[PDB]
Amino acid sequence: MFEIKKICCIGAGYVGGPTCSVIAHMCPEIRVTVVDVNESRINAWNSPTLPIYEPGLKEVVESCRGKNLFFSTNIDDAIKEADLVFISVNTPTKTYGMGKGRAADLKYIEACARRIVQNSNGYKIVTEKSTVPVRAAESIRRIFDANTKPNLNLQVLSNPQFLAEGTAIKDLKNPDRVLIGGDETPEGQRAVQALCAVYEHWVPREKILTTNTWSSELSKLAANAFLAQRISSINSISALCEATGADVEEVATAIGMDQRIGNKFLKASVGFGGSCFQKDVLNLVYLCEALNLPEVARYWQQVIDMNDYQRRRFASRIIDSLFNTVTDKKIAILGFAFKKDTGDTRESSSIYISKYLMDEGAHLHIYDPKVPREQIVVDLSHPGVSEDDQVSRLVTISKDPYEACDGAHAVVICTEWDMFKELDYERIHKKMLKPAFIFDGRRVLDGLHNELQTIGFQIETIGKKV
Amino acid sequence: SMFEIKKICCIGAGYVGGPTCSVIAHMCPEIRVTVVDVNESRINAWNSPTLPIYEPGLKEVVESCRGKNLFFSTNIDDAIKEADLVFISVNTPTKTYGMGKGRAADLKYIEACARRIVQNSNGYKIVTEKSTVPVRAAESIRRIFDANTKPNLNLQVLSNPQFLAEGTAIKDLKNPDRVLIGGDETPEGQRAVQALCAVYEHWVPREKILTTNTWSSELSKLAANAFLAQRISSINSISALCEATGADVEEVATAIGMDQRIGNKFLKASVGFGGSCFQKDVLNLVYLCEALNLPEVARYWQQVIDMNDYQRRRFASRIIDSLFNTVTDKKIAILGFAFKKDTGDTRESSSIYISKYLMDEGAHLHIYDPKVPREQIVVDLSHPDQVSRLVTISKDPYEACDGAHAVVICTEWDMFKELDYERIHKKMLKPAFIFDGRRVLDGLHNELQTIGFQIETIGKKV
Amino acid sequence: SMFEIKKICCIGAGYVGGPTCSVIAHMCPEIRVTVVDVNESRINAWNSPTLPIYEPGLKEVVESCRGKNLFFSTNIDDAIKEADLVFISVNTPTKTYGMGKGRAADLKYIEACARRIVQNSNGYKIVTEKSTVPVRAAESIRRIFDANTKPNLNLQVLSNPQFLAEGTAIKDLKNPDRVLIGGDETPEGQRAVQALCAVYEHWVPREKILTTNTWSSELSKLAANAFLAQRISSINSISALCEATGADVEEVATAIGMDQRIGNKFLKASVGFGGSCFQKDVLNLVYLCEALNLPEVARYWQQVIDMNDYQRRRFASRIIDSLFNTVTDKKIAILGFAFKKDTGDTRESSSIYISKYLMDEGAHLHIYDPKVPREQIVVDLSHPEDDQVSRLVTISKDPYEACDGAHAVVICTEWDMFKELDYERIHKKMLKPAFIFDGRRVLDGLHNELQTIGFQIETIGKKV
Ligand SMILES: *[C@H](O)[C@H]1O[C@H](OP(=O)(O)OP(=O)(O)OC[C@H]2O[C@@H](n3ccc(=O)[nH]c3=O)[C@H](O)[C@@H]2O)[C@H](O)[C@@H](O)[C@@H]1O
Ligand SMILES: *[C@H](O)[C@H]1O[C@H](OP(=O)(O)OP(=O)(O)OC[C@H]2O[C@@H](n3ccc(=O)[nH]c3=O)[C@H](O)[C@@H]2O)[C@H](O)[C@@H](O)[C@@H]1O
Numbered sequence A: 001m002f003e004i005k006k007i008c009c010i011g012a013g014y015v016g017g018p019t020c021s022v023i024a025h026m027c028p029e030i031r032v033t034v035v036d037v038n039e040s041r042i043n044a045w046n047s048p049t050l051p052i053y054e055p056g057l058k059e060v061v062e063s064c065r066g067k068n069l070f071f072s073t074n075i076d077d078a079i080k081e082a083d084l085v086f087i088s089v090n091t092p093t094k095t096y097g098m099g100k101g102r103a104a105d106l107k108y109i110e111a112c113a114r115r116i117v118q119n120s121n122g123y124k125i126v127t128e129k130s131t132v133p134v135r136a137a138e139s140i141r142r143i144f145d146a147n148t149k150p151n152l153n154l155q156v157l158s159n160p161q162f163l164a165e166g167t168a169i170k171d172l173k174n175p176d177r178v179l180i181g182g183d184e185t186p187e188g189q190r191a192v193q194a195l196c197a198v199y200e201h202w203v204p205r206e207k208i209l210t211t212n213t214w215s216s217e218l219s220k221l222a223a224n225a226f227l228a229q230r231i232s233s234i235n236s237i238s239a240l241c242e243a244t245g246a247d248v249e250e251v252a253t254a255i256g257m258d259q260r261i262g263n264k265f266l267k268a269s270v271g272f273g274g275s276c277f278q279k280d281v282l283n284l285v286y287l288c289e290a291l292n293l294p295e296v297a298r299y300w301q302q303v304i305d306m307n308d309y310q311r312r313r314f315a316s317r318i319i320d321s322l323f324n325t326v327t328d329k330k331i332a333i334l335g336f337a338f339k340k341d342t343g344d345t346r347e348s349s350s351i352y353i354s355k356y357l358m359d360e361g362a363h364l365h366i367y368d369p370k371v372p373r374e375q376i377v378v379d380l381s382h383p384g385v386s387e388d389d390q391v392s393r394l395v396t397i398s399k400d401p402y403e404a405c406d407g408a409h410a411v412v413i414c415t416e417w418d419m420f421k422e423l424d425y426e427r428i429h430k431k432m433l434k435p436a437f438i439f440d441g442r443r444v445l446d447g448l449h450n451e452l453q454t455i456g457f458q459i460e461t462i463g464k465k466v
Numbered sequence B: 001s002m003f004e005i006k007k008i009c010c011i012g013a014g015y016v017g018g019p020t021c022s023v024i025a026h027m028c029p030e031i032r033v034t035v036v037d038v039n040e041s042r043i044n045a046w047n048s049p050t051l052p053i054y055e056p057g058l059k060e061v062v063e064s065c066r067g068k069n070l071f072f073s074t075n076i077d078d079a080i081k082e083a084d085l086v087f088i089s090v091n092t093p094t095k096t097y098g099m100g101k102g103r104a105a106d107l108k109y110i111e112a113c114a115r116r117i118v119q120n121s122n123g124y125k126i127v128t129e130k131s132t133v134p135v136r137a138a139e140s141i142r143r144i145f146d147a148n149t150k151p152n153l154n155l156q157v158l159s160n161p162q163f164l165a166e167g168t169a170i171k172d173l174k175n176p177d178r179v180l181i182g183g184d185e186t187p188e189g190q191r192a193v194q195a196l197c198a199v200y201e202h203w204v205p206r207e208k209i210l211t212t213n214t215w216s217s218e219l220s221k222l223a224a225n226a227f228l229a230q231r232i233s234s235i236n237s238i239s240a241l242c243e244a245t246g247a248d249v250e251e252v253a254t255a256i257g258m259d260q261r262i263g264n265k266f267l268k269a270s271v272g273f274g275g276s277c278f279q280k281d282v283l284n285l286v287y288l289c290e291a292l293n294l295p296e297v298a299r300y301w302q303q304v305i306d307m308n309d310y311q312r313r314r315f316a317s318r319i320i321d322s323l324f325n326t327v328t329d330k331k332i333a334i335l336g337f338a339f340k341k342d343t344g345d346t347r348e349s350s351s352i353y354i355s356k357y358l359m360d361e362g363a364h365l366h367i368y369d370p371k372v373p374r375e376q377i378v379v380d381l382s383h384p385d386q387v388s389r390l391v392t393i394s395k396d397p398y399e400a401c402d403g404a405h406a407v408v409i410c411t412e413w414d415m416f417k418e419l420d421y422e423r424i425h426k427k428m429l430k431p432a433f434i435f436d437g438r439r440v441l442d443g444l445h446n447e448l449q450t451i452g453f454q455i456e457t458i459g460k461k462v
Numbered sequence C: 001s002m003f004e005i006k007k008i009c010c011i012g013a014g015y016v017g018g019p020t021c022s023v024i025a026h027m028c029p030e031i032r033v034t035v036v037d038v039n040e041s042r043i044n045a046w047n048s049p050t051l052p053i054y055e056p057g058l059k060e061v062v063e064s065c066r067g068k069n070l071f072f073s074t075n076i077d078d079a080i081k082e083a084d085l086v087f088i089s090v091n092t093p094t095k096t097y098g099m100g101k102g103r104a105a106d107l108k109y110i111e112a113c114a115r116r117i118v119q120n121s122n123g124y125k126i127v128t129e130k131s132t133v134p135v136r137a138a139e140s141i142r143r144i145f146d147a148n149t150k151p152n153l154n155l156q157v158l159s160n161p162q163f164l165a166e167g168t169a170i171k172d173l174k175n176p177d178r179v180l181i182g183g184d185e186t187p188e189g190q191r192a193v194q195a196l197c198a199v200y201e202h203w204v205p206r207e208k209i210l211t212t213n214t215w216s217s218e219l220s221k222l223a224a225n226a227f228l229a230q231r232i233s234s235i236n237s238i239s240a241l242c243e244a245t246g247a248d249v250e251e252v253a254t255a256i257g258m259d260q261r262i263g264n265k266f267l268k269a270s271v272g273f274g275g276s277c278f279q280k281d282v283l284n285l286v287y288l289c290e291a292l293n294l295p296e297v298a299r300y301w302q303q304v305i306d307m308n309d310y311q312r313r314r315f316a317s318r319i320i321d322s323l324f325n326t327v328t329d330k331k332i333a334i335l336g337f338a339f340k341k342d343t344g345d346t347r348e349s350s351s352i353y354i355s356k357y358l359m360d361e362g363a364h365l366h367i368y369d370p371k372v373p374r375e376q377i378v379v380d381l382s383h384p385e386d387d388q389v390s391r392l393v394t395i396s397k398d399p400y401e402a403c404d405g406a407h408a409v410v411i412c413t414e415w416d417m418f419k420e421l422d423y424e425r426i427h428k429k430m431l432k433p434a435f436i437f438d439g440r441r442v443l444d445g446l447h448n449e450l451q452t453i454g455f456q457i458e459t460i461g462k463k464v
């Protein structure tokens, strides 16, 4: 029976903007208002240069902005008029106190919940859209229950999103699944159905999965944990390959041809990054500790410990290969983004590799085709330090890769940009100090090893014995 | 592409060797395939109407070519002598004493085969490891060969691991997800590899035959099983978290599995994985890591096992705590003893371990399984007096539950969801519990509560 | 105050059930009290002139009302059937195998009683745990009753722990510091609690009857014993420090105990506390804590036991070090085997442990106790007809035999007779150097005289 005609989305960020933009585009008869405290970001959504870069996003926004898609700072009225209110704010990791570095900080979710109840009457569906710790919905419900009004009936749902950087629009238009959690009560099921009906405008019913609220919240974190575990698992095998003479790409292919295991997310690397995996796994581990499930905690912690070991051993190879001394040695870092085809550096392995080398006094020359130089400088700087001394002494940002390798002892590939396999390595060899090393942290130079040895490089890569 | 295999000898007529070489013979009528073994009784059984291994389809495969191009014989020496390709298909059991006790593989049989092969061989042959071996096995075979060389003797060593699951061996051989062959990157090595590919190409598409180096091949078999076991431990770990929060493990498993990068197979929570492969292979991986000074990698894979161990123990603990932390002289029905449904195999079955935890509490177990022989259950629960005092093997599940305090489902036999639970309830002591260690009774919980049971299952909050 | 108990059935005719229900019958002539047990021999003994439990005053209490309103019988079913209040007074021994081995309580007997009670009951009854139980026991009984319900069957579950110390059971029952009763906060619960109070009000002042919730009641019994054991481990820990500094433990104990907030009882340093209560109950508390994810609390109480274990072990070590770290074939007199004086009970007695430490050194022990039967000493020192005991242990008929040709005299139990022995005589026939190790401070004041005779005399809490 219930039909959603007006949607408010609190938070115009990496999740809220694109998700609500696609909803508006697929549901012309639903008014969608995306709001945010940050005036400058709203203005950018209302501009020709969107604050988030994602392929296809511009054309989605432009097709319905001003018609049924709106971006505004008027949060109150947008809540007031809405049938469904999406909560799409960040829950950052606590930087102090109990659970420091692992527990989520619910301050913004809570502030939204309180603002919602303050500005609401009658019936609304309130839906968690950004990634939240398990039990977030219970907290929202508690705020609502404690701040009740006559005829106020707020229903709380979970609707996690599954966007990957660089494929957001394809992820929204053709998702593997849509996930919605709500209570097993009649009102709960009514709210769930209403949100399903929104998605049914473009997503087949058999791809919409409905669960209880807890299952939903837990599924998001668990899904990321399983993905991260695949990477840490094949990375663990890469270490074994180096020790034995096996080759991690051969092994990955053999394993992945078993259709029970599948062939995705088995690309060995110096280590996974991004703003999702580490944060979500660490949150899962904290949840387990809080619930007195230490065995489960220890089990998932291994995903992070392995990623840390993969980075550290890669850094150790480089340092050992240069005689355990890197003081004043020029080293080229090729790739700073957390993966290719993005400028995002969040939890990028390049930051950690770089930091290990800076602790050895290396002169790093860093090249990335898309990451802005100011971001590199921030990432490698000591917190609060506005003119950090180490970065100033040790870090150069190069404008091209040949500058970065000119007079270098080693070339360290940390991000799998396609352009790195196309470089003129003969030319690079000539102006490097000898012995000249290439450390391939992404297996991008596979099939070029003989070529590179013949030129005179010592070429090493993860998951291949030296 | 020059060398052509026309005669094959397989040393070992076991779970792996017999079926595999039978299928090869069936698919390659022009190749003579001779499977050999020291065990005379087993060879006779292969030559009989009652095969020593039960696998669906295997009888009809063997009967279609036995006596024509498929032979089973005790004459190991002449089989090797005549062969172009010699498969080594013997077990490498876990060491029961000494360095690596309980984890390291015992290469005695592989070594014996390697010595016998070089003793009975001249000229050119391809020698291929077919059963599961530790990484570096091929190096050992190669060392024996190199140390025992003859003029004109040219033996090539390959790895060709098996991917047979109990109950599906024939489908797994006729329609494999992939065939895996490893050999050296040398010209002789690559000729050996191509010769063996040509055998498989009689019925497997080229695109499903993967060739690697020897190490990659050996490591792939252990690793694949480690990944499969990890999926089970990972979802089992989520099952504990579901019990603590109100999330439901089947809901979470479905949600996770619909991500095509993760896939939807091997996400059925359980009391714990069993079988002769997973624990043995993971523990061998862990031991390899420790021997190579990779303690971080060792610890990472050990968690797969630790989690399995925890899943069993906490299941046992739920039962015991539910019965007031005393089980002395209490009758408990154990339904299911096999390590999975539709087999009689009990190796490393979770039912053994759950049963042993309850025996430690002095429970009177009444065990029912539709296929496991009673004498195996007795052996499994015996010390290498308690069994006699505490264990009864029931001939049907209603006997097992008659006067019982709890019904514990450990194996997912389909028949267990169809039992007359109203009848069972009547003759059980009260309070009457059902512990479903396989989620087979999903959807029946309201009904069972109405009858009067306390029904609990893994991955569901009480 | 409506409900009135007129018939009481007590399941378990043991150390707790017999005396407790005997006193009830003695103080409440108009209530019929029937004590029952599966052990026929024990019921006969309660119906005999030689009672199966020795406690001062107990004979005269039983004889004053047995056959009148006090009955001992093996007919458990009819006793339950007729009863208004059913006491459950069976043992809950420590689990000897499985989960919680050596610490968790085994509820088998409590459960068997609960099932038998519901089987033989109709209408209204009050069921009361009387023997010491782990926390949550009452919840278990309630679950069995709820699962095995009948029309008009209304069973109420209460907790009523006992506080009897070996040797003072009758005084502890007639003149208790308090009576403790727990039950639910519901109206039916409170009516059951008041009904049981009314029984005690026949001889205990209302102000000494404390009513609580069921959990508080169960936990109070364990906790009270934990506090008492903690006082002994605390003063014993001070005894070690005294030996290290020249302070004297009896001086310190006196000084501490004169603070009225601390009190002056249970501050007698010793080789270590024993008995069937303290170790068992503290270890059950520790287990409960672990099961509830309270490891800090678990560690906190475990220290009471670890300190008792240390006190014993360091005492044994003093002896062994003093005899040059070799005791093989050396004759050593153990004076005192009971867990405290004025009893034959040896359960968890420090003498057992001290003796075992010396047997592992190959000592020839000659053990004297004025009340412990020899057969019990042999059982206590045997492996669960033992070889070690046979080779190494002699049970002496008198203390002069035990000390004849001995290297050391080890006092482990504070029997009064040990301070009045002829130590000059003992000295003459001991091997030299002759030692006395006083594990109970019974020879305080005699040290100069003993040194003059020629002994090396050492005691806990006194620097050498
Ligand atoms: C947010 O919850 C989002 O998280 C994932 O998307 P990301 O934006 O984090 O990108 P990816 O998941 O594609 O890459 C993440 C890191 O993993 C490394 N990686 C990936 C695959 C592989 O085989 N090896 C490997 O190292 C990448 O290089 C990155 O460093 C998730 O995919 C989304 O579903 C999710 O919503
Ligand atoms: C030997 O190398 C062989 O190992 C596996 O075969 P299995 O005979 O062991 O059969 P399964 O893999 O089917 O069963 C293993 C156990 O895991 C449990 N399980 C399985 C899936 C799941 O979702 N949950 C779960 O608990 C089963 O109940 C079994 O107890 C392997 O399959 C073969 O590839 C390999 O050759």
Ligand SMILES: *[C@H](O)[C@H]1O[C@H](OP(=O)(O)OP(=O)(O)OC[C@H]2O[C@@H](n3ccc(=O)[nH]c3=O)[C@H](O)[C@@H]2O)[C@H](O)[C@@H](O)[C@@H]1O
Residues within 6 Å of the ligand: C132, C162, C163, C164, C165, C166, C225, C232, C265, C266, C267, C268, C269, C270, C272, C273, C274, C275, C276, C277, C278, C339, C340, C341
């Ligand atoms: C049962 O719960 C019962 O347990 C206690 O009674 P006990 O029968 O155990 O005797 P005591 O408590 O008198 O003595 C116990 C052990 O402590 C030693 N002790 C005592 C006091 C002291 O200052 N120092 C010391 O070493 C004794 O020598 C015994 O070995 C409890 O008293 C009862 O309330 C309880 O109900």
Ligand SMILES: O=c1ccn([C@@H]2O[C@H](COP(=O)(O)OP(=O)(O)O[C@H]3O[C@H](CO)[C@@H](O)[C@H](O)[C@H]3O)[C@@H](O)[C@H]2O)c(=O)[nH]1
Residues within 6 Å of the ligand: A010, A011, A012, A013, A014, A015, A016, A035, A036, A037, A038, A041, A088, A089, A090, A091, A108, A111, A112, A130, A131, A163, A275, A276
């Ligand atoms: O009280 C508040 C707090 C925050 N915000 C706004 O909420 C938006 C949040 O944007 P963002 O930081 O991108 O958070 P999310 O959109 O939740 O996305 C993050 O988390 C995702 C998965 O959950 C990752 O995929 C992304 O890369 C990562 O940026 C920001 O614009 C904030 O200004 C408000 O309007 N009000």
Ligand SMILES: O=c1ccn([C@@H]2O[C@H](COP(=O)(O)OP(=O)(O)O[C@H]3O[C@H](CO)[C@@H](O)[C@H](O)[C@H]3O)[C@@H](O)[C@H]2O)c(=O)[nH]1
Residues within 6 Å of the ligand: B011, B012, B013, B014, B015, B016, B017, B036, B037, B038, B039, B042, B089, B090, B091, B092, B109, B112, B113, B131, B132, B276, B277
């Ligand atoms: O010189 C010889 C000649 C023959 N054999 C025989 O080798 C055969 C081996 O058969 P089997 O014991 O069944 O080993 P596998 O075929 O390798 O199978 C084992 O290991 C598999 C994984 O590799 C599991 O799937 C199986 O359940 C498990 O039995 C036996 O018949 C032995 O008699 C020798 O050991 N030495």
Ligand SMILES: O=c1ccn([C@@H]2O[C@H](COP(=O)(O)OP(=O)(O)O[C@H]3O[C@H](CO)[C@@H](O)[C@H](O)[C@H]3O)[C@@H](O)[C@H]2O)c(=O)[nH]1
Residues within 6 Å of the ligand: C011, C012, C013, C014, C015, C016, C017, C036, C037, C038, C039, C042, C089, C090, C091, C092, C109, C112, C113, C131, C132, C164, C276, C277
């Ligand atoms: O199903 C059963 C089991 C036992 N009994 C009898 O119950 C009595 C149990 O009494 P007992 O073994 O003496 O236990 P309690 O009376 O609880 O006394 C023990 O526990 C006390 C701590 O509270 C200590 O003070 C005592 O020394 C110690 O014997 C025995 O006669 C048993 O035969 C039954 O009637 N039915």
